[PDB]
Scaffold this motif. Sequence first.
Motif, mmCIF file in Angstrom:
data_model
loop_
_atom_site.group_PDB
_atom_site.id
_atom_site.type_symbol
_atom_site.label_atom_id
_atom_site.label_comp_id
_atom_site.label_asym_id
_atom_site.label_seq_id
_atom_site.Cartn_x
_atom_site.Cartn_y
_atom_site.Cartn_z
ATOM 1 N N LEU C 51 -7.173 -25.061 -21.217
ATOM 2 C CA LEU C 51 -6.126 -25.019 -22.234
ATOM 3 C C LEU C 51 -5.642 -23.580 -22.434
ATOM 4 N N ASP C 52 -6.054 -22.962 -23.549
ATOM 5 C CA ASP C 52 -5.787 -21.552 -23.820
ATOM 6 C C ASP C 52 -6.869 -20.661 -23.204
ATOM 7 N N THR C 53 -7.004 -20.742 -21.889
ATOM 8 C CA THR C 53 -8.122 -20.113 -21.197
ATOM 9 C C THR C 53 -7.958 -18.593 -21.098
ATOM 10 N N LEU C 54 -6.923 -18.165 -20.380
ATOM 11 C CA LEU C 54 -6.692 -16.752 -20.098
ATOM 12 C C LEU C 54 -5.951 -15.997 -21.211
ATOM 13 N N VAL C 55 -5.234 -16.689 -22.098
ATOM 14 C CA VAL C 55 -4.610 -15.963 -23.228
ATOM 15 C C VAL C 55 -5.707 -15.341 -24.084
ATOM 16 N N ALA C 56 -6.906 -15.920 -23.984
ATOM 17 C CA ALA C 56 -8.066 -15.470 -24.736
ATOM 18 C C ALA C 56 -9.042 -14.633 -23.877
ATOM 19 N N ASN C 57 -9.185 -15.017 -22.606
ATOM 20 C CA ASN C 57 -10.087 -14.339 -21.656
ATOM 21 C C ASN C 57 -9.390 -13.201 -20.891
ATOM 22 N N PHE C 58 -8.653 -12.382 -21.642
ATOM 23 C CA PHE C 58 -7.799 -11.348 -21.070
ATOM 24 C C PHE C 58 -8.215 -9.985 -21.615
ATOM 25 N N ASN C 59 -8.303 -9.011 -20.715
ATOM 26 C CA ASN C 59 -8.829 -7.697 -21.064
ATOM 27 C C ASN C 59 -8.200 -6.590 -20.240
ATOM 28 N N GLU C 60 -8.728 -5.380 -20.391
ATOM 29 C CA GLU C 60 -8.329 -4.261 -19.557
ATOM 30 C C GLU C 60 -8.433 -4.632 -18.066
ATOM 31 N N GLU C 61 -9.358 -5.520 -17.710
ATOM 32 C CA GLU C 61 -9.513 -5.884 -16.298
ATOM 33 C C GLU C 61 -8.237 -6.541 -15.725
ATOM 34 N N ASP C 62 -7.584 -7.421 -16.477
ATOM 35 C CA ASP C 62 -6.390 -8.055 -15.929
ATOM 36 C C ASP C 62 -5.094 -7.299 -16.236
ATOM 37 N N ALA C 63 -5.178 -6.377 -17.184
ATOM 38 C CA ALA C 63 -4.139 -5.376 -17.401
ATOM 39 C C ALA C 63 -4.210 -4.316 -16.279
ATOM 40 N N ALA C 64 -5.407 -4.070 -15.756
ATOM 41 C CA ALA C 64 -5.520 -3.152 -14.652
ATOM 42 C C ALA C 64 -4.985 -3.871 -13.426
ATOM 43 N N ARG C 65 -5.287 -5.173 -13.346
ATOM 44 C CA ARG C 65 -4.846 -6.046 -12.260
ATOM 45 C C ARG C 65 -3.335 -6.084 -12.163
ATOM 46 N N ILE C 66 -2.684 -6.369 -13.277
ATOM 47 C CA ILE C 66 -1.241 -6.388 -13.304
ATOM 48 C C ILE C 66 -0.668 -4.989 -12.990
ATOM 49 N N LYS C 67 -1.445 -3.938 -13.283
ATOM 50 C CA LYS C 67 -1.041 -2.538 -13.025
ATOM 51 C C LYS C 67 -1.115 -2.167 -11.547
ATOM 52 N N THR C 68 -2.213 -2.551 -10.888
ATOM 53 C CA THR C 68 -2.401 -2.330 -9.458
ATOM 54 C C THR C 68 -1.489 -3.245 -8.653
ATOM 55 N N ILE C 69 -1.250 -4.439 -9.200
ATOM 56 C CA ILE C 69 -0.467 -5.490 -8.529
ATOM 57 C C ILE C 69 1.035 -5.332 -8.848
ATOM 58 N N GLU C 70 1.355 -4.251 -9.558
ATOM 59 C CA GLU C 70 2.709 -3.706 -9.611
ATOM 60 C C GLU C 70 2.727 -2.598 -8.568
ATOM 61 N N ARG C 71 3.636 -1.636 -8.715
ATOM 62 C CA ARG C 71 3.729 -0.467 -7.822
ATOM 63 C C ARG C 71 3.728 -0.766 -6.302
ATOM 64 N N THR C 72 3.668 -2.050 -5.935
ATOM 65 C CA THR C 72 3.763 -2.463 -4.531
ATOM 66 C C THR C 72 5.020 -3.296 -4.301
ATOM 67 N N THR C 73 5.294 -4.207 -5.233
ATOM 68 C CA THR C 73 6.391 -5.167 -5.096
ATOM 69 C C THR C 73 7.783 -4.507 -5.049
ATOM 70 N N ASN C 74 8.652 -5.065 -4.199
ATOM 71 C CA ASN C 74 9.998 -4.514 -3.953
ATOM 72 C C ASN C 74 11.118 -4.949 -4.927
ATOM 73 N N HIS C 75 10.755 -5.236 -6.181
ATOM 74 C CA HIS C 75 11.738 -5.664 -7.176
ATOM 75 C C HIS C 75 11.616 -4.928 -8.502
ATOM 76 N N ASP C 76 10.521 -4.172 -8.669
ATOM 77 C CA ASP C 76 10.247 -3.378 -9.890
ATOM 78 C C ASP C 76 9.877 -4.259 -11.119
ATOM 79 N N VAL C 77 10.827 -5.077 -11.594
ATOM 80 C CA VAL C 77 10.585 -6.028 -12.703
ATOM 81 C C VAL C 77 10.266 -7.452 -12.196
#
Lengths: 310, 310, 310, 310
Positions: C51-77
């Motif tokens: 249900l509300d799994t990851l909206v609650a199980n979210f931390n610096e780890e997946d903010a780091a994930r979204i950070k590393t998993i940016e800066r590569t993609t060819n669309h910026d946003v």
Amino acid sequence: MELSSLTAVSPVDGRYGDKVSALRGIFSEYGLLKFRVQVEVRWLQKLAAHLDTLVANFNEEDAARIKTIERTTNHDVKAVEYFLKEKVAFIHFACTSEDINNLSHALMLKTARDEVILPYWRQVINAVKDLATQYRDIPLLSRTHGQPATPSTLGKEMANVAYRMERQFRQLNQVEILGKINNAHIAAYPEVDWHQFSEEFVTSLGIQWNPYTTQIEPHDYIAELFDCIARFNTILIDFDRDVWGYIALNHFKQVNPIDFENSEGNLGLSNAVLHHLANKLTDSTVLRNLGVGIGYALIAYQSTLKGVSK
Amino acid sequence: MELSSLTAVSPVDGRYGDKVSALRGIFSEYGLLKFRVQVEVRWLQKLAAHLDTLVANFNEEDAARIKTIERTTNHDVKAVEYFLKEKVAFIHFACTSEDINNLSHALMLKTARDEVILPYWRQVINAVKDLATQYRDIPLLSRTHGQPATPSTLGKEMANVAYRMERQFRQLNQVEILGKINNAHIAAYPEVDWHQFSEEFVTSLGIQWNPYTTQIEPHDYIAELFDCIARFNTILIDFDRDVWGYIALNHFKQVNPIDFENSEGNLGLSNAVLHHLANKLTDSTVLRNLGVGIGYALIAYQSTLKGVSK
Amino acid sequence: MELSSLTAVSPVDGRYGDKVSALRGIFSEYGLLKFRVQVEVRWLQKLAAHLDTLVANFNEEDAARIKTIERTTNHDVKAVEYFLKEKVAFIHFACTSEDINNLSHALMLKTARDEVILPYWRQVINAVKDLATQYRDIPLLSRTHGQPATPSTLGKEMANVAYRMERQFRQLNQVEILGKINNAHIAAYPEVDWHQFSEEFVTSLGIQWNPYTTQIEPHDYIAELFDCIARFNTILIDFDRDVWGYIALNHFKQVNPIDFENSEGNLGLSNAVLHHLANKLTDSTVLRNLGVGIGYALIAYQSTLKGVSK
Amino acid sequence: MELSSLTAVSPVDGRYGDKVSALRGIFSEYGLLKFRVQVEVRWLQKLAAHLDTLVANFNEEDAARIKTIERTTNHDVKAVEYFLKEKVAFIHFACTSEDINNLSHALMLKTARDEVILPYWRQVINAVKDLATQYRDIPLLSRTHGQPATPSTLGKEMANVAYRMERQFRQLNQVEILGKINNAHIAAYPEVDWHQFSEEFVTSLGIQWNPYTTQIEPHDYIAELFDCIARFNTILIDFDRDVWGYIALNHFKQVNPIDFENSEGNLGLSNAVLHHLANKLTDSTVLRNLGVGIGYALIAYQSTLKGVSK
């Protein structure tokens, strides 16, 4: 609904219409006209490369003239052209503009600084140097007995204020107010070294000159002047908070600290406007309010000068 | 050196002496006197617990009177006592003050808000609602072809501005301007429920009333009003930067965006002063400049209203 | 050169890294991500219209994930697209955005207001209501004997402050934080009243809803909130200047007024930044510093709360 | 709830934790300690009137030490005494303070100015001098055909910006950062000309010296420095509004003006804080945020430097 010192909206024109009076010659609709025609006239004294009648014989009457003799012409700008051309009653008919327009702004700023701000600052410094050498020996603060922090004399600590004020004096004043110049017309003059007629000109207005190139009248030495007045102004509010404050304490025995509150009042307002205008990026609306933030410091000064005398 | 719209220092009295004229009745030395005697007179209509001649027949002449009939008396405050006492030519001789002094400030603020700020905001909103429903279909921005970001219609995006302006309308207006009351004298009146004579009084002035106790006229609903005008004022500068900007682009074909620059100009100044006064901690110097920051928005409005018509 | 509370540059992260700690969940790079995915996820719970799994199980780890998993993609946003798509390990593949992005900002602001600013203001009000009902009878000011102006009790005059603070409490809080909605995709959903799925949605986030149209999330109820905190903040500086000040005088006999100076210190800084951000006209840089001016009031509060206790 | 660049509250520590990194050595809790012990140690090199081990071998470890070795002592101030006394493992036991404390502040300011602000300004000036001599010949504005106002070249008008920036360079830098000195102890030293040990000392720190008397370290050359950075900062925002703006127009054919918007963003924030701190009247809270307003300009610079490259 009329318009006088009673019914004025702003206090610089109203409550303190006068003695702040001196700004009327400089920053009013009149002022800046008075300034722009002078300069654009003192140049036509250009014709000497071949007297000062109206630059001196100029008043609200010819500012009203230029005002009525605008609002009709189909070009909006160069209304000043037709007026000077009117008072031509010869082949003087060369009306170059623009760099001349900066010289105007420089000169009004220059005159404000030398003939009002500074003479005021100097009264204020002096009155602080008296009130200090009079309060020598008068101790202060610390915390009676059982606590110190720091113990001095109200007089020595007023000396620093006069000294701080002295630095912002020197700081104003060394703010450089610059200017420079540079038609198919001026080739009626084949006999002049134009760089030189220009350097001579600028300088003759008491503006500092010219090159490194001539391109950037960045034109905010206004920032520079205004961050300085406001530096001084803040020093004074500090002073204000000392007297009102000491006379808070000298009310433990048996004078109205009004004036030091007022001076504080208006100084915060100078600074507000002054800073505002200083950080705003032809600046005609900025231009039309150069005298307001200044109008407010004068009140503060006349008010501090007023307290003291007490 | 005289003192008119030509030789005024601030533009609200000078260039825009008039149509900003309406503030002369409220924030000038006159205004606040006119306001303080009214109230301190409408109360003496107290005597009805047993007409409005001079509250209405009052002008610069009796403001000059109270001005000349000050500067002589040996008490500084209560100069207003002798004037009202002069125009006594009966046993009305009760001159209680203080809470009445707040009611004055509330009323002038109240009148400014209802009879000038709001009527101005409403013109401004309307003119934005026209210029939108006229620019419907006119597209904007994005980036021609090969780039988007976001594509809309200049008209719909002007509707939001009118809508934003509408919220700050409602926000002003729901700012509560409060008041309340509460000698060995008033025991000539043994027949009145004083809470009630007070609630009736305050209210009769159109001020909102009274208690929760009566102690804190915190007396900065001024902050509240001024953060609101300045919120609106900023919305308008945003609008200003849209027209001047669109007509930057409509200068890719073949109107003077002056007025939208001016309106921007003065609004930054309103806000400067307005905010200043709003964050300053009897506030007589703050009090004496309540009309300045407001004087500046009126110019901005008359100027935006002026552009548009074009 | 490392990066901790010792070597931090700003005090909100540094000296007061903690207890101001709570802002880390909201305004840090993390915060606003944490907020944007929630919402853009709580909507995909859209799939319930079938249900509300990851909206609650979210931390610096997946903010780091979204950070590393940016800066590569060819669309910026739309870097956020690939992350949520990654944690898909079904036919949920609908990633509408934009109005959702406003809901994010509203919610973070909403949470700041309800779960930190207000709980702080309430401690501050209470501690003022104690220090008043404890200083009842303690007289003040006037001028010993031979001069009055106005005589009260330090306690009653502290009651007004608590009352003033109470009004800005109510004023915050009644600031409306709004939101609304309104692909070729959502026509996989032919069975929902979309206005309603939207009203239900917005509301479910505790945002106030919708129309009058849906066009202008003017999106500066931030102005409105911030002119309010800063109104309160100023009330508190006023309070600060009363204690430090009274204990200036209670140092005429035989406690460190530090804390009341600090609280003053930081409040002037909140207000500086807060106002700044409030008058600035996607606001990503404004967005990235929403927590700073707020970070500064918390220090001021923890500091006033600290003095008092003394 | 942890504390890193992800979960930081302010962007200077967070998003731009690094490359703004250099401020960590100066304005963090560490910085100012690192600065205060140096100086108060370089003086004890006083003992030479009869090496630099720990002034250089000092880190977060001994800043943590001084932090833990505070919060226990029963005097609050002079925690620094016991630490330096700890690392004494000889008869060096003279711990005079105060004027030394100013020298600290001067030096940190001095180092900020010479080793970060200026090296940044110089990159920024250079990159403007390139982007100008590259955009030579590229025309601008006026109004196509049928309207002028004023026609130039985007390049020459970027030269002025570099020139304006040059003046605020020279203006920073000529801001005088002063210092001076002047127990029953120092009469263990009967062999030194103390004025001289002092002039030698101050100077050795690269501070400008001494007298006119020694009394007023007015101690706001901070004002002076900060009105200058903010003057420069405003010049740069002006530059920012030129590129973003020109590339608004170069989007009439077929680069992301992000960076010039950011640089604008942060500069308005520097200036906000910078000015704030500059007009505030031991200033420990002002002191603890000297690096913030500066932290914000660095971002702006790294961002302008980043755009350009494009």
